[PDB]
Symmetry: C2
Subunit: 204 residues, 2 copies
């Protein structure tokens, strides 16, 4: 099969797809759609929304996958990254839901004028961002291993890395000297996944 | 009149429009179009390309302006930022054309996958970027004043600031310890235009 990740934002909703495929050792192809190319490409994408995954098999047959986080869930489930037990599966979804709430606050500042972006960034950083970070910090403490859920890589580990990079995009010093469990999670995940470390370092 | 700057990129071709209006003391309104809103907004924009300037007068009448650099030229010409003499007008366009060539190389890395962006960035930084910077550096030396052309602010001063920020976007250390005339131009322009300094500092 040939997996093509059709996206637009360099670090948007498609990062959970790539990080899941990178950690699973599955190859893929990046196809970034430009702002000027989107009007003519959108009718070709089922649903008309990005990101989307296009899978082509050895015979040229095409099947389309939508809803970035649903794609990452399916790829992580097939490669044992959604919890081995039902209780671990809940803990994976518990941190994912908390990360989604933090991604929801970060999304409020995207694609706004410079004056409006700084205002909304100023509100969430003094509002729900530190509150949600404490909830995420408590979920990491309740884990049975060095990672978010258990001791091996799950989807909750990868969506957490993406949302923390989004938080640092709003303020590079928001986590400096704070949230030690979040900093130790990145160190433990980077050591537990050498392929994830190479992707993150080469992306920088 | 009410000037609306319809754009998409936070720091793209619309920066020359804003910096020209800021230095001239003319108020404007930012209207950023999102990637998801572009398919339905494009038929409303004459020409179907961004950025574009929408001017509404006291009676609601609308006149449209296209081609970002042509808009900046008209606004700079009306506020005496295109040279007082014909020979100064040539020197303004001389550095603008050299900046456009450097913007042309920077545009090759935009909206590409992470692997492809790093490759093209690696080629221009070892190619035309240092060559064009030397040509821009020599044009600054031949000036009759502390700025790019003469002693007062012109459009060549502002497009140079925008292209240098684009170069630092590719590599923050490309100008460290190199090109002293380029660093002194930003210092002289910031002192010659307090409104430009506030815009640049508030934008950061």
């Amino acid at each position: 099969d040939h997996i093509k990740v059709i996206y637009f934002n360099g670090r948007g909703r498609a990062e959970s797809i790539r990080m899941t495929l990178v950690a699973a050792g599955v190859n893929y192809e990046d196809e970034r759609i430009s702002f000027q190319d989107w009007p003519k490409i959108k009718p070709t994408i089922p649903g008309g929304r990005l990101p989307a995954v296009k899978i082509t098999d050895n015979h040229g047959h095409v099947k389309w996958m939508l809803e970035s986080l649903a794609i990452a869930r399916y790829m992580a489930k097939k490669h044992h990254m959604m919890g081995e037990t039902d209780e671990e599966y809940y803990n994976v979804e518990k941190l994912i839901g908390q990360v989604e709430d933090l991604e929801h606050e970060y999304h409020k500042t995207l694609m706004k004028p410079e004056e409006e972006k700084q205002k909304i960034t100023k509100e969430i950083l003094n509002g729900k961002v530190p509150v949600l970070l404490d909830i995420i910090c408590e979920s990491l403490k309740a884990s049975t291993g060095k990672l978010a859920v258990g001791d091996k890589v799950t989807l909750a580990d990868l969506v957490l890395i993406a949302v923390i990079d989004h938080v640092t995009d709003l303020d590079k010093e928001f986590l400096t000297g704070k949230y030690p469990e979040i900093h130790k999670h990145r160190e433990n995940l980077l050591a537990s996944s050498p392929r994830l470390a190479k992707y993150l370092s080469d992306r920088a």
